[PDB]
Design a protein around this ligand. Sequence first.
Ligand code: ZN
Length: 95
Amino acid sequence: ALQNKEEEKKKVKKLQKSYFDVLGICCTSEVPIIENILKSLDGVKEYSVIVPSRTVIVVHDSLLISPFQIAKALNEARLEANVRVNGETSFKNKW
Ligand SMILES: [Zn+2]
């Protein structure tokens, strides 16, 4: 029955949380490096690196900093970052 994020209910309605897909993510020793990039950014409140599920979550104020800035920062390191990939849903042509 849907994700029902209501379970966590981290915040009632503050800032704008965004999810980034880091494909260029390898090992776990890069954790510190990944966190360092976010630290450099301003407006970020908190973040966590989940390699086990290959997912990255970060909470920041859209006004202070937009998701594009976070994704761009990751791109600099060349770790390939994307905000919620919508894929393309091919009819039948898929490599
Ligand atoms: Zn590595």
